[PDB]
């Protein structure tokens, strides 16, 4: 449909800073990392996907 | 290696459209392995695992769907159900019990939407 | 279990006291057959399977899918403003079984106390299970059988 | 009293009954995950109002 | 007309619901008892109610 | 974490009453981004009288310059954070509470939620798709 | 069967009213349906509830909210006198008009969309028009309608491509008119608050319709004279009309110049005694109010 230019590469790079800043386990509440933990364990001993039980 | 995927999706979408080849693109053309760049090249860099799960659910929906739909028709139709069973193999499906007989159904409905999927 | 016999005979207790009509029991093997002993006794008007809602009009298959939300439902009679089932106790309870020989099941059926069970009074029923099943004292007897002494329905 | 208490499930049933669990389990994943991403693309949006230089 | 007493099994509730899901198993609320309901004097409704407010 | 600063500065020179408030968004500012932390909004609040007649630093204080910070910053660095403010003899008053993340990531500030902008998209969206 | 016959009664006819039976608000309609017993049935207390009322009540009109209650009373008020403000309305013989030249609401006419041009103004009135919504019911209308909105998104993707495919390629001016037309096109077949409940015209007030003259042995009457009361001796502030209490209704009066030297002398007062006015107009407002002029016709 088109026929404001493009955005500065170093726009968009800070743009993806802000998204790993704000996203960063080093940066989030220690039960974050804790459910990851799980998600891992719990992989490392399912039967078969799914298995939660 | 400090190029990143937007920059290098940036030159391979400017070299697409200005005919510049640096031999930036033929390292690029190793650090992805994408040796034609082409517009349909990007998009098979940019893919993502969630589109394939979109389609295989609809696939699973369908089977479910179509494996249902196909026995309740049958069931509700007592001559087409006992053509049916003849014409997989069934040997006089007529003299046959309402829970030995539906599970024949069951299992070739079963055997006609996963078998030959 | 005969935990659930137990909850049974004191949940029908209840529902004589308020003289509610129809009331449902869990659906199990046993329960069934203590039902139905109870129906062919003259203890119950009705006996149904059904679900956790009520009683099933047309018949349904009872599976795994549907086995937990499975019922009896069973009809209490009243007669000239009595509850014709009043009273319903174990004998043999969860923490001391008593398992009887023929011999003593006819000593309880002739007045006398068999180990502290008072013995069998006028129009009272006592269960007995032998081999999974169950059936009327004197029945046992004329079977020959030993058994389990359930319970007293009066 | 002679029908039988429980029916056991036939193989076909278990098979249909897997599957719709299957199902019921990847789909709840997959829009947990469309979710996840639909916020990522409107904190994409905003990320130039953020500030990280 | 609505009956009373009557349980939606499972089985009778073959097609996914409003959420997309199938229904493999009694919810809670199909597991508890319900005879309260058979004792409870219906609350009587009628369609011209809702007209002549 | 996001976090939501609201800090009360002294306005000691009445030409620039403004000045400290700039000179301080700055200082915190350039903490949070160089460890690692995003500033997602400065909304300053205006000069206001203060409630009571306040004390710090062996001075006293009848007004204030009030501004909101929301940013973005581990526990570690809110806490640094806090412990240069409650320093600082410029800052009068500083509170740094948690925004809950939980549920989405993008919360305004609580002035702008308190008005019914719960995103700051939704506070973007009507400065470009209406303005 | 017995449940068909309740539902045709005479109690289930009465529609559910929980108002508040001593309302001291502003009422501008009637609130309740009265009830009227016969002189015969008063006799005996008999007024076709549940239970007797008591025997005290004289007045053979009241209004109630419940048949029984926990405190083993009716809930009932006495009192009737909304039918004498319509009945004395009628007397005024005073058709209400529409201030705004509307279609007339008991006739079923041929309307077309010149109105419907706004449609992006009443299809958001659904989502918009949540003065008093809850905040979370509200909330609802966001999810719900998204999804069911979402529903159309392929056969709006198709359609608009095929035709308006220019405006997809051009511009975006045009397209949102395609879409409001989209999707009022895709609900008209819905039902979206299919019953509209607010008030119909003169909501029963008055069925006259303008035009008819009074004939009188004294010739055709051109203006109606009707007694009227002063409530205030000073014009509502703000406002350049007094206020008159004609028939059960509150009217704003305008004098012919200046107004006359009893209000004065009668100060606070000036509500005990009787004036003659001239009913000008009367229209009726959203509300469910009726604006009434008047004319404070003066002996001259």
């Given at each position: 449909?088109?026929?404001?230019?493009?955005?500065?590469?170093?726009?968009?790079?800070?743009?993806?800073?802000?998204?790993?800043?704000?996203?960063?386990?080093?940066?989030?509440?220690?039960?974050?990392?804790?459910?990851?933990?799980?998600?891992?364990?719990?992989?490392?001993?399912?039967?078969?996907?799914?298995?939660?039980? | 290696?400090?190029?990143?995927?937007?920059?290098?999706?940036?030159?391979?979408?400017?070299?697409?459209?200005?005919?510049?080849?640096?031999?930036?693109?033929?390292?690029?053309?190793?650090?992805?392995?994408?040796?034609?760049?082409?517009?349909?090249?990007?998009?098979?860099?940019?893919?993502?695992?969630?589109?394939?799960?979109?389609?295989?659910?609809?696939?699973?929906?369908?089977?479910?769907?179509?494996?249902?739909?196909?026995?309740?028709?049958?069931?509700?139709?007592?001559?087409?159900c006992d053509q049916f069973l003849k014409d997989h193999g069934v040997e006089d499906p007529l003299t046959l019990k309402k829970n030995i007989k539906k599970n024949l159904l069951r299992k070739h409905v079963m055997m006609d939407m996963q078998q030959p999927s | 279990s005969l935990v659930k016999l137990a909850n049974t005979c004191a949940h029908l207790q209840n529902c004589s006291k308020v003289r509610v009509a129809l009331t449902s029991i869990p659906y199990t093997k046993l329960q069934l057959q203590f039902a139905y002993n109870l129906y062919q006794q003259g203890f119950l008007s009705s006996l149904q399977k059904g679900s956790t809602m009520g009683p099933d009009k047309d018949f349904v298959e009872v599976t795994p899918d549907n086995i937990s939300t499975r019922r009896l439902w069973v009809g209490l009679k009243?007669?000239?403003?009595?509850?014709?089932?009043?009273?319903?106790?174990?004998?043999?309870?969860?923490?001391?079984?008593?398992?009887?020989?023929?011999?003593?099941?006819?000593?309880?059926?002739?007045?006398?106390?068999?180990?502290?069970?008072?013995?069998?009074?006028?129009?009272?029923?006592?269960?007995?299970?032998?081999?999974?099943?169950?059936?009327?004292?004197?029945?046992?007897?004329?079977?020959?059988?030993?058994?389990?002494?359930?319970?007293?329905?009066? | 009293?002679?029908?039988?208490?429980?029916?056991?499930?036939?193989?076909?049933?278990?098979?249909?009954?897997?599957?719709?669990?299957?199902?019921?389990?990847?789909?709840?994943?997959?829009?947990?995950?469309?979710?996840?991403?639909?916020?990522?693309?409107?904190?994409?949006?905003?990320?130039?109002?953020?500030?990280?230089? | 007309?609505?009956?009373?007493?009557?349980?939606?099994?499972?089985?009778?509730?073959?097609?996914?619901?409003?959420?997309?899901?199938?229904?493999?198993?009694?919810?809670?609320?199909?597991?508890?008892?319900?005879?309260?309901?058979?004792?409870?004097?219906?609350?009587?409704?009628?369609?011209?109610?809702?007209?002549?407010? | 974490?996001?976090?939501?600063?609201?800090?009360?500065?002294?306005?000691?020179?009445?030409?620039?009453?403004?000045?400290?408030?700039?000179?301080?968004?700055?200082?915190?500012?350039?903490?949070?981004?160089?460890?690692?932390?995003?500033?997602?909004?400065?909304?300053?609040?205006?000069?206001?009288?203060?409630?009571?007649?306040?004390?710090?630093?062996?001075?006293?204080?009848?007004?204030?310059?009030?501004?909101?910070?929301?940013?973005?910053?581990?526990?570690?660095?809110?806490?640094?954070?806090?412990?240069?403010?409650?320093?600082?003899?410029?800052?009068?008053?500083?509170?740094?509470?948690?925004?809950?993340?939980?549920?989405?990531?993008?919360?305004?500030?609580?002035?702008?939620?308190?008005?019914?902008?719960?995103?700051?998209?939704?506070?973007?969206?009507?400065?470009?798709?209406?303005? | 069967?017995?449940?068909?016959?309740?539902?045709?009664?005479?109690?289930?006819?009465?529609?559910?009213?929980?108002?508040?039976?001593?309302?001291?608000?502003?009422?501008?309609?009637?609130?309740?349906?009265?009830?009227?017993?016969?002189?015969?049935?008063?006799?005996?207390?008999?007024?076709?509830?549940?239970?007797?009322?008591?025997?005290?009540?004289?007045?053979?009109?009241?209004?109630?909210?419940?048949?029984?209650?926990?405190?083993?009373?009716?809930?009932?008020?006495?009192?009737?006198?909304?039918?004498?403000?319509?009945?004395?309305?009628?007397?005024?013989?005073?058709?209400?008009?529409?201030?705004?030249?509307?279609?007339?609401?008991?006739?079923?006419?041929?309307?077309?969309?010149?109105?419907?041009?706004?449609?992006?103004?009443?299809?958001?009135?659904?989502?918009?028009?949540?003065?008093?919504?809850?905040?979370?019911?509200?909330?609802?209308?966001?999810?719900?309608?998204?999804?069911?909105?979402?529903?159309?998104?392929?056969?709006?993707?198709?359609?608009?491509?095929?035709?308006?495919?220019?405006?997809?390629?051009?511009?975006?001016?045009?397209?949102?008119?395609?879409?409001?037309?989209?999707?009022?096109?895709?609900?008209?077949?819905?039902?979206?608050?299919?019953?509209?409940?607010?008030?119909?015209?003169?909501?029963?007030?008055?069925?006259?319709?303008?035009?008819?003259?009074?004939?009188?042995?004294?010739?055709?009457?051109?203006?109606?004279?009707?007694?009227?009361?002063?409530?205030?001796?000073?014009?509502?502030?703000?406002?350049?009309?007094?206020?008159?209490?004609?028939?059960?209704?509150?009217?704003?009066?305008?004098?012919?110049?200046?107004?006359?030297?009893?209000?004065?002398?009668?100060?606070?007062?000036?509500?005990?005694?009787?004036?003659?006015?001239?009913?000008?107009?009367?229209?009726?407002?959203?509300?469910?109010?009726?604006?009434?002029?008047?004319?404070?016709?003066?002996?001259?």
């Open positions: 449909s088109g026929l404001v230019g493009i955005e500065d590469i170093e726009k968009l790079e800070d743009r993806r800073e802000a998204i790993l800043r704000i996203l960063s386990m080093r940066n989030s509440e220690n039960k974050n990392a804790i459910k990851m933990a799980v998600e891992l364990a719990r992989k490392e001993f399912e039967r078969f996907p799914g298995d939660t039980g | 290696e400090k190029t990143t995927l937007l920059r290098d999706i940036r030159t391979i979408q400017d070299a697409l459209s200005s005919g510049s080849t640096p031999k930036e693109l033929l390292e690029i053309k190793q650090r992805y392995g994408i040796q034609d760049f082409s517009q349909e090249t990007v998009r098979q860099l940019l893919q993502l695992d969630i589109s394939g799960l979109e389609v295989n659910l609809e696939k699973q929906r369908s089977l479910i769907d179509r494996i249902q739909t196909r026995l309740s028709e049958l069931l509700s139709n007592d001559l087409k | 009243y007669r000239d403003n009595k509850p014709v089932l009043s009273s319903c106790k174990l004998i043999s309870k969860p923490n001391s079984r008593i398992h009887l020989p023929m011999e003593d099941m006819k000593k309880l059926c002739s007045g006398v106390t068999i180990r502290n069970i008072k013995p069998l009074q006028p129009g009272e029923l006592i269960l007995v299970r032998a081999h999974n099943n169950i059936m009327d004292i004197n029945e046992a007897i004329s079977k020959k059988l030993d058994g389990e002494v359930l319970c007293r329905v009066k | 009293m002679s029908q039988p208490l429980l029916r056991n499930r036939s193989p076909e049933e278990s098979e249909l009954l897997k599957l719709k669990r299957n199902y019921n389990r990847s789909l709840l994943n997959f829009q947990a995950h469309k979710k996840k991403l639909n916020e990522l693309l409107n904190l994409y949006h905003v990320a130039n109002e953020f500030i990280v230089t | 007309g609505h009956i009373i007493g009557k349980l939606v099994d499972v089985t009778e509730q073959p097609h996914a619901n409003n959420k997309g899901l199938y229904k493999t198993r009694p919810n809670s609320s199909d597991k508890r008892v319900g005879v309260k309901r058979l004792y409870r004097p219906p609350k009587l409704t009628y369609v011209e109610d809702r007209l002549r407010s | 974490m996001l976090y939501e600063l609201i800090g009360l500065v002294r306005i000691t020179n009445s030409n620039a009453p403004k000045l400290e408030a700039k000179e301080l968004s700055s200082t915190i500012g350039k903490l949070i981004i160089q460890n690692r932390g995003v500033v997602r909004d400065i909304v300053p609040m205006g000069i206001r009288y203060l409630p009571k007649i306040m004390k710090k630093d062996q001075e006293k204080h009848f007004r204030a310059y009030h501004f909101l910070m929301l940013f973005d910053s581990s526990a570690a660095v809110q806490s640094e954070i806090l412990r240069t403010l409650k320093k600082d003899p410029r800052v009068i008053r500083s509170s740094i509470v948690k925004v809950d993340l939980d549920k989405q990531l993008d919360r305004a500030s609580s002035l702008h939620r308190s008005l019914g902008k719960k995103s700051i998209l939704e506070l973007v969206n009507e400065d470009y798709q209406s303005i | 069967t017995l449940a068909e016959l309740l539902g045709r009664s005479r109690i289930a006819q009465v529609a559910n009213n929980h108002k508040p039976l001593t309302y001291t608000g502003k009422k501008f309609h009637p609130t309740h349906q009265i009830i009227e017993t016969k002189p015969s049935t008063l006799y005996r207390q008999e007024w076709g509830l549940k239970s007797a009322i008591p025997s005290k009540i004289k007045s053979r009109y009241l209004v109630y909210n419940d048949l029984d209650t926990l405190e083993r009373i009716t809930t009932f008020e006495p009192r009737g006198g909304t039918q004498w403000n319509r009945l004395r309305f009628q007397e005024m013989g005073v058709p209400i008009v529409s201030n705004i030249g509307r279609q007339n609401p008991f006739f079923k006419y041929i309307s077309r969309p010149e109105d419907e041009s706004h449609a992006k103004l009443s299809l958001f009135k659904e989502m918009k028009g949540d003065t008093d919504i809850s905040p979370a019911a509200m909330k609802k209308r966001l999810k719900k309608i998204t999804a069911l909105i979402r529903s159309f998104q392929d056969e709006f993707k198709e359609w608009l491509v095929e035709n308006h495919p220019d405006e997809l390629k051009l511009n975006s001016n045009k397209l949102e008119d395609y879409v409001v037309k989209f999707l009022n096109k895709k609900l008209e077949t819905k039902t979206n608050k299919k019953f509209n409940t607010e008030i119909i015209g003169t909501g029963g007030l008055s069925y006259s319709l303008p035009g008819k003259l009074k004939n009188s042995p004294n010739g055709v009457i051109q203006r109606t004279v009707v007694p009227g009361r002063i409530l205030n001796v000073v014009k509502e502030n703000n406002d350049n009309k007094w206020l008159a209490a004609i028939g059960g209704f509150v009217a704003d009066v305008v004098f012919f110049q200046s107004p006359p030297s009893s209000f004065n002398s009668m100060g606070d007062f000036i509500r005990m005694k009787t004036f003659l006015f001239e009913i000008l107009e009367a229209s009726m407002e959203k509300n469910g109010s009726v604006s009434m002029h008047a004319r404070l016709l003066e002996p001259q």
